[PDB]
Design a protein around this nucleic acid. Structure first.
Ligand SMILES: [Mg+2]
Ligand SMILES: [Mg+2]
Ligand SMILES: [Mg+2]
Ligand SMILES: [Mg+2]
Ligand SMILES: [Mg+2]
Ligand SMILES: [Mg+2]
Ligand SMILES: [Mg+2]
Ligand SMILES: [Mg+2]
Ligand SMILES: [Mg+2]
Ligand SMILES: [Mg+2]
Ligand SMILES: [Mg+2]
Ligand SMILES: [Mg+2]
Ligand SMILES: [Mg+2]
Ligand SMILES: [Mg+2]
Ligand SMILES: [Mg+2]
Lengths: 215, 102, 151, 50, 100
RNA sequence: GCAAGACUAAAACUCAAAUGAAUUGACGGGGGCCCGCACAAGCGGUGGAGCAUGUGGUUUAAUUCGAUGCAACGCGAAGAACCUUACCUGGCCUUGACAUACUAGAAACUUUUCAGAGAUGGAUUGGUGCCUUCGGGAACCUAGAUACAGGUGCUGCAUGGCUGUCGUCAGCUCGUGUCGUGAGAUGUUGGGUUAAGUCCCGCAACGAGCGCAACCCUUUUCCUUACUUGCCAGCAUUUCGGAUGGGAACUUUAAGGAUACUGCCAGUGACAAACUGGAGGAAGGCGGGGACGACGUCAAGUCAUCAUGGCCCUUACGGCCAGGGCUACACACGUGCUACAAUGGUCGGUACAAAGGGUUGCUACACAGCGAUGUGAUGCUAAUCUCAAAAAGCCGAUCGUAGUCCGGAUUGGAGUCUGCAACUCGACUCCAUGAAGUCGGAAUCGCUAGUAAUCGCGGAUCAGAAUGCCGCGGUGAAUACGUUCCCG
């Protein structure tokens, strides 16, 4: 049947939330709405920079956004002017000023989101779906994941009848809560409608629990 | 037996249909009488607002006094055809079950 | 069930008479977990019956229970599409349970003002030998006697 | 969890607020300045009362 | 919801914000004992004569992201449909699944 | 040939197949082997009545749209007087209430009335701001023009995402080998065994993955840290109230640790797994609950959360407004609440909880009122003040089987509160009235222990509006011989 969100099931177990701040019951809604707005803005701005994660933090009367990027050059800017505009936009969005930080990704083919975007790009450009799937699986396994799983569903090839096709290699123990599983979803908009892409990547079992994560 | 017949938005239902369905169903299944206490028929059109050879789904589910409820489905191009197919299938199923249980 | 052997629970003895049998009887009388009212009813009935004749209430209760306990019952066996009520012996626990249930039900169907009064009347009737529980005992003997033929 | 109609199919979430209390007594001028100088990490709202 | 629905909600909020001060002053005058009876009656008439949209009772909570008028969940400000998604992505701080 | 009939033996026409052996499933009133409140043994219900709620039909101008056997019907809706609102009657606007692109003038804004049901329209006040290589620009309006906006309009049978069910059922599949002409087979089969494709023995199989179990939350015992606002064992003072000076013992609070592993003894089994009876321990053979949903099935549900391909409307299928409707009532169903009383009703006194909520709020306490409440006022951003009265229970009195001193529907007067406004159409209070009902057809449902039955308390939604939903604690059962017949 249906399945729980792989990230959703491990928030307090082996993963951490993507937002870390405290609010009183009254300002919580405002903070959450503005965080969603800034995430929506960043997703559109940095579409071509291969961004993987956004960490929004409110230390005290200020803001701190950490952007995980495979291409730090584009986000940083040739002379660093782009980051100034980014912080200006973030301060405009959030009442207190925001500071940006960059986390360089050196093994992009281990990140589920990046793989899903890569597959979706080819699928929108009309490459064969099970060509892109096998390419992504082989690249991730070469990278070194203990396992990868890819799912593509929709009107594949323009077919009148929609269908779903998946490929898996290695290990993906979803039922093991102590396992590092990265999950991602992406959408491809083709002339014949939408195609959905799901990616699972397994990076071995985490030891020591949340204390090892140092929560 | 009490009769509870329902349709969907596509099919269109009326009290005239209720009376006709009740009369026909009772006439066909009058033999069992006390053996059976409840009928519920349901009508749908699947791909509503389009057409096909079957394009309509009839169901009838009956509760026999004693044994557990038993259900039957049929697909046909018209409401009357769906009803007739479902009636025939119910008759066969009830005959088989009663012969089995003796 | 299809497996396991569930063990029996322990019923603590009653306060006044320290009798597990009387505690079990109170549990039969009890409704909706109102055990305090159950004890009130049972003890009122016991006082009422003690008033009639001067004897130990516990001894009177156990004597009447022995009077009302069953001997033999049939358990329906479905073979060849027929009832085949087959007489059989029953364990002491079942004997006691059916006796208590019959007493309480007969008291409930009696026609006095209060449950204590009608329970006391039922105990007196069972001691005498004419009551609804006595009639159910007689009926079960009669039917298991009619069907003695089968094993 | 269902878009349209399933009342029995739901997700139950919880959020917890943890509170801790500290007193410091016989404090000195260097202690108070050290406490003010100390940095604050996110996720922990700290209230100081004199 | 429709953009017309959202715009109606916004204009209602704007009107309430505009007229809150006068509404509160009139209610205080109405509830003031030392004030004269004629003054209280005039305050009541002005409060009844204020524009309808100035009344906060005419505002309906909406998701904000989608504008849905059901399942609002004040604390988060999001209707259930989007709240579940945001929570199970890991973007809502402190919220986890419950098992007790 | 007595007869029944036997032997010899066509054509017209009609179909695209009919067949033999063998392979995978499904199925069997075929067979063995297992499991489940599936039977059995029990406790309490629905189906009868009054009311609540949802649906179907009729009705209306409108009763807006979805959900339809188990798995639709207290379902989307975690809350329709206006608003919500998507519907109807009528009055209104047309680059539109909202985005980008072009041109020109104006700070944005701001005070009053007038017409009207309002949307709208016509008058009338005050200010002229923030930066400039000041000759021009940011904000926020007005006026014109063109691509365009706008759609809860259709298609869930064109889709993404999400969800139900078989079903926490124990199964479902791959690589290398082998076997067969092949579909395919083995492995995954046979013995024991487990809750379990769980485990041990054999075996053309050897190896892997997804499922089972474990890792995660909560409860039971104990240890360390922490002494607040929470606690009071030894001391003292007490307007005898942990109230006070005090203490860090105990309860508690909330992080981290220990413990339980068939660990040991006596038996059984192939000397295997494994299974019985014991000691110790708070707890003994998965201790009790919760999350966690395999490969797959039903063109299952959702274009009305949202996104999206394709069709459709464009002075209306778009937008603003005032009233009405979603609450209708010859009827038929589903899910509930309250009762039919003495295991009880009424009156007086009197004990014992746990979990949550409170600054646009919870409110000690005094007064006024029969009361719902009102006024004054106090402490609380809370282990501090508060919602707050726990109720079943126990003690005393009356009632003495009556449609009642049971029941509280319906109707007639009088009010409080929330709100611009309670007519349609709110919750609650007082006086008067006192309906059906005296235990409910065939049929059928839930439940194996702190469970069922019963008693009260809190919350999300929310101005107000729960018998619904999600939680919390108090009292506390009955019965399992057994799997023979009932089903999956
Ligand atoms: Mg369909
Ligand atoms: Mg829309
Ligand atoms: Mg409202
Ligand atoms: Mg039974
Ligand atoms: Mg329900
Ligand atoms: Mg309305
Ligand atoms: Mg579907
Ligand atoms: Mg449909
Ligand atoms: Mg598991
Ligand atoms: Mg629709
Ligand atoms: Mg209106
Ligand atoms: Mg309604
Ligand atoms: Mg009364
Ligand atoms: Mg009568
Ligand atoms: Mg409310």
């Amino acid at each position: 049947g249906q399945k729980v969100h792989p990230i959703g099931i491990r928030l307090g177990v082996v993963k951490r939330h993507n937002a870390n701040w405290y609010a009183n019951p009254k300002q919580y809604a405002e903070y959450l709405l503005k965080d969603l707005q800034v995430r929506e803005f960043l997703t559109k701005k940095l579409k071509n920079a291969m961004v993987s994660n956004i960490l929004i933090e409110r230390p005290s009367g200020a803001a701190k956004v950490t952007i995980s990027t495979a291409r730090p050059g584009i986000v940083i800017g040739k002379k660093g002017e782009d980051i100034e505009k980014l912080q200006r936009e973030l301060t405009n969005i959030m009442g207190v000023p925001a500071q940006v930080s960059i986390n360089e990704i050196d093994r992009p083919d281990l990140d589920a989101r990046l793989v899903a975007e890569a597959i979706a790009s080819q699928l929108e450009k009309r490459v064969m779906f099970r060509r892109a799937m096998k390419r992504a699986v082989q690249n991730t396994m070469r990278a070194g994941a203990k396992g990868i799983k890819v799912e593509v569903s929709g009107r594949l090839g323009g077919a009148e009848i929609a269908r779903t096709e998946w490929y898996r290699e290695g290990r993906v123990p979803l039922h093991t809560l102590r396992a590092d599983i990265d999950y991602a979803t992406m959408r491809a908009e083709t002339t014949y409608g939408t195609i959905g892409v799901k990616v699972w990547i397994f990076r071995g079992e985490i030891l020591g629990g949340m204390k090892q994560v140092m929560n | 037996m009490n009769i509870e017949i329902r349709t969907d938005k596509n099919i269109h239902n009326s009290e005239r249909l209720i009376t006709y369905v009740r009369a026909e169903l009772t006439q066909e299944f009058q033999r069992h009488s006390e053996r059976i206490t409840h009928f519920s028929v349901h009508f749908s059109d699947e791909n509503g607002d389009k057409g096909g050879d079957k394009d309509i789904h009839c169901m009838i589910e009956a509760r026999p006094s004693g044994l557990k409820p038993v259900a039957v489905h049929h697909k046909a191009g018209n409401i009357d055809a769906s009803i007739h197919g479902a009636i025939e299938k119910l008759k066969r199923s009830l005959e088989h079950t009663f012969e089995k249980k003796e | 069930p299809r497996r396991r052997v569930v063990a029996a629970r322990e019923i603590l003895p009653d306060p006044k008479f320290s009798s597990q049998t009387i505690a079990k009887f109170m549990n039969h009388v009890m409704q909706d977990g109102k055990k305090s009212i159950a004890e009130s009813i049972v003890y009122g009935a016991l006082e009422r019956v003690q008033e009639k004749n001067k004897v130990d209430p516990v001894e009177f209760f156990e004597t009447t229970l022995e009077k009302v306990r069953p001997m033999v019952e049939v358990k329906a066996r479905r073979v060849g599409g027929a009832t085949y009520q087959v007489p059989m012996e029953v364990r002491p626990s079942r004997r006691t349970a059916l006796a208590m249930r019959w007493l309480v039900d007969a008291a409930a169907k009696r026609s006095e003002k209060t449950m204590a009064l009608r329970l006391a009347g039922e105990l007196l009737d069972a001691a005498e030998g004419k009551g609804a529980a006595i009639k159910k005992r007689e009926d079960v003997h009669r039917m298991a006697e009619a069907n003695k033929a089968f094993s | 969890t269902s878009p349209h109609v399933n009342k029995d199919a739901r997700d139950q979430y919880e959020i917890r607020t943890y509170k801790r209390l500290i007193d410091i007594v016989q404090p000195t001028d260097k202690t108070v300045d050290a406490l003010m100088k100390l940095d604050l990490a996110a996720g922990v709202d700290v209230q100081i009362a004199l | 919801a429709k953009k017309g629905m959202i715009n109606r909600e916004l204009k209602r909020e704007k009107t309430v914000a505009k007229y809150a001060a006068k509404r509160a002053e009139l209610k205080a005058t109405i509830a003031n004992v030392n004030a004269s009876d004629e003054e209280r009656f005039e305050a009541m008439l002005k409060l009844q004569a204020l524009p309808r949209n100035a009344s906060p009772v005419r505002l309906r909570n909406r998701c904000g992201l989608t504008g849905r008028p059901h399942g609002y969940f004040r604390k988060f400000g999001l209707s259930r449909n989007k709240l579940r998604d945001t929570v199970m992505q890991g973007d809502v701080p402190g919220v986890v699944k419950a098992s007790w």
